[PDB]
């Protein structure tokens, strides 16, 4: 449920590496901001990524 | 089975080979037949409500149905049997004399 | 379902002994209440019931050789009728 409501990007896993190439597990998160938009004829607060926010949505 | 209660029987094999008798009972589940005067056994029976005195009772025992052949009511010899639907009923037919046993 | 609430009478020494005090012992199905038993008895037998007592019996463990099980559960009712009432023959 912690994900963007437009272009629903969320966290994904991957590796953290050191010099000497030791490998460990980590995640990458999206920068979702809690913003008030019109999901219907009504406004509400939702998670929206900052990428989906630079052209098109109405705050 | 091929042999019914109330039929006439010729015994084809066994200790009583060559004898004839009548069917007193039939046991199709276990495939045996009871025939009068055939295969007599002696039972040692204690006194009981049935058989008040008890003793060595000489009675009959079943034999296998394959040791048996039907006797033609007219020709009087053991025959294999066929089946012919004559009228509204399927009847048994002697396969030597070509006649109806029933 | 009066004939379903009452199954059969109970015939033992204790029940036969109490037969003379206008008390009748019956086996009833395991879901019936006292009131249902009372009205079923009054409809089947045309008596006037004064009181009903009930009790429950568990099944007994039994064995008949390598196999063990239980007998049925039972619900037992004693019905006492009024002084000015007819009787049940048994």
């Amino acid at each position: 449920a912690k994900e963007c409501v437009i272009t629903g990007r969320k966290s994904r896993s991957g590796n953290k590496r050191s010099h000497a190439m030791n490998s460990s597990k980590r995640t990458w998160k999206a920068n979702l901001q809690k913003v008030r938009i019109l999901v219907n004829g009504k406004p509400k607060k939702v998670w929206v990524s900052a990428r989906a926010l630079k052209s098109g949505k109405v705050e | 089975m091929h042999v019914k209660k109330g039929d006439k029987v010729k015994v084809i094999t066994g200790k009583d080979k060559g004898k004839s008798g009548k069917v007193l009972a039939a046991f199709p589940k276990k495939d045996r037949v009871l025939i009068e005067g055939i295969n007599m056994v002696k039972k040692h029976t204690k006194p009981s409500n049935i058989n008040p005195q008890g003793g060595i009772l000489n009675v009959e025992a079943p034999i296998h149905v394959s040791n048996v052949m039907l006797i033609d009511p007219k020709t009087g010899e053991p025959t294999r049997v066929g089946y012919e639907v004559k009228g509204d009923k399927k009847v048994r037919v002697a396969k030597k004399s070509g006649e109806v046993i029933d | 379902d009066a004939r379903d609430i009452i199954k059969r009478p109970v015939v033992t020494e204790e029940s036969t002994s109490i037969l003379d005090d206008k008390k009748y012992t019956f086996e009833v199905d395991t879901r019936a209440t006292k009131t249902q038993v009372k009205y079923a008895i009054e409809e089947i037998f045309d008596v006037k019931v004064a009181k009903v007592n009930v009790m429950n019996y568990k099944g007994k463990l039994k064995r008949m050789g390598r196999y063990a099980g239980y007998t049925n559960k039972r619900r037992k009712a004693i019905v006492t009728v009024t002084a000015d009432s007819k009787e049940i023959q048994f």
Partner: protein, 59 residues
């Protein structure tokens, strides 16, 4: 069975009631120890069952 279908769906239930009374009396006699032939129980039970079958299938 075919003669049951000749009844007017109201005498059918009178027959059912009479059969239920007979079955109860039979079980009373069996418990008391005064029932001579016990094969009547099956007959009465099957008769009631077929009454009910014919009533139900008439809807």
């Amino acid at each position: 069975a075919n003669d049951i279908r000749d009844l007017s769906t109201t005498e059918i239930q009178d027959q059912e009631k009479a059969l239920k009374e007979e079955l109860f009396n039979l079980r009373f006699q069996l418990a008391t120890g005064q029932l001579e032939n016990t094969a009547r129980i099956r007959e009465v039970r099957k008769a009631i069952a077929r009454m009910k079958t014919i009533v139900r299938e008439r809807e």
